[model samples]
Target: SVLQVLHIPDERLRKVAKPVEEVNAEIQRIVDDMFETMYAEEGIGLAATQVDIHQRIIVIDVSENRDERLVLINPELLEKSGETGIEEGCLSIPEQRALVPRAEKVKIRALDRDGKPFELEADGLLAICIQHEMDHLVGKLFMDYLSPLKQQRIRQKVEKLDRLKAR
Candidate 1:
């Protein structure tokens, strides 16, 4: 089942996700739902925290054909190099975009859905997507990179949307 993606002003989005101790059926189901929700939202990547699941899990599919889905559990960045500014968007922050600076390349270590450790190096949009989703695990959002005023305005706009939906 696809889970609802949490929006801004949801306090759980500001909480750091706990690392998963094991990759069992339950964790696998969460990963599946994350992917389903990401696809439903037409997003390239998603974090567990975005769905109010406090687990260090991220799903990404930066492939142009949308076929290269990946599941990373308790991912840690081993290295980052260069810099690139990307126009980034988040499923949690719908209709908002930011030109965020991120590493052009990154090497990360994480466990796969099967609990096997793997190391991967990514560049271009894939690298940025990985970093962006990983940030959610630490209670961080792309909006945090913007000016405080901009963040405040974004909060206001999001809140307005929430109120409108309440009608």
Candidate 2:
């Protein structure tokens, strides 16, 4: 099933996610549903927080063919190098995009679906996506990097959309 992704102005999206104590059946289901929701929203990455689940989980499929789905449980950023400004978008911030500064390359330590620990190096879009999603784990959004005026405008737009949806 495709889960509902919480958009900006949703208070839950501002909550920092808690680390998953263990990767079990429920955690696996959340991961699966995240991918479904991400695909449904035509997004390349999604954080558990975006779906109103306060857990340290994220799903990414930056592959051109969309065949490579990556899951990170209780992920930790081990190292980052260089810097790059990439145009970024978020499932939680619909119809909004911005150039966000992020690490050009990153090494992360995380648990796989089976709770196995692994480390991976990523660059390009993959690295940007990882860092973007990781921000959600800490109750941060790409828009947070924007000026206050810009963020207020986005919030107003998002709130208007929410009202329209409620009708």
Candidate 3:
């Protein structure tokens, strides 16, 4: 059930996702698949866009023991505070990690698996991870955090991949 993700530098990953209008059976299925995919990949978070699904849905489970999982639908950041520099990584961007400054704490409003609304405060890794995934929802990527030189390098790499795929 681990869906192959569209890797970073793929233009599809840069698309801004639209909100889900209804949380019916279809949405439920997506949630289930996302969990399966995340666990299978040993990743802590995944956005819908990563799976070629353009919707405002993301799943995360950061429990140190992996016993607890967190799923959010239409997640929205309510508040954020402080700043911390942390090395971030994404499944889409394999073998790549970078230190990005992000809010150390944040308040998020989102619906749970049951479609019930809830708000939670997140800090530390959770905060950073939330922001990272949210960026994907808006056509943004972590590589955008890098310096001009690093960004140019990524662009070159992306172009190279495209060229090879064109063959």
lDDT of 1 by residue, 1-167 (tens): 88998999788999999999999999999999998999988999999999988999999998878889898999999999998987898888877888999999999999998889999999999999999999999999999999999999888888887788779
What tens-digit string does per-residue lDDT give for candidate 3 at 36-126?
9988888899999999999999899888887777877899889999989787877887656788989999999998887888998999888
For model 2 the local lDDT of residue 163 reads 86
What's the TM for model 3? Answer: 0.90
TM-score of 1: 0.96
Greater TM-score among 2 and 3 belongs to 2
Query: Which residues of candidate 1, in runs, are more than 4 Å off?
Result: none
Q: What C-alpha lDDT values do all the predictions have?
A: 0.92, 0.92, 0.85
For model 1, state the Cα shift of residue 4 in Å.
Answer: 1.1
Pairs of colliding residues, candidate 3: none
The TM-scores, one per candidate, come to 0.96, 0.96, 0.90
Model 3: runs farther than 4 Å from truth? 154-167
Show the colliding residue pairs in model 1.
none
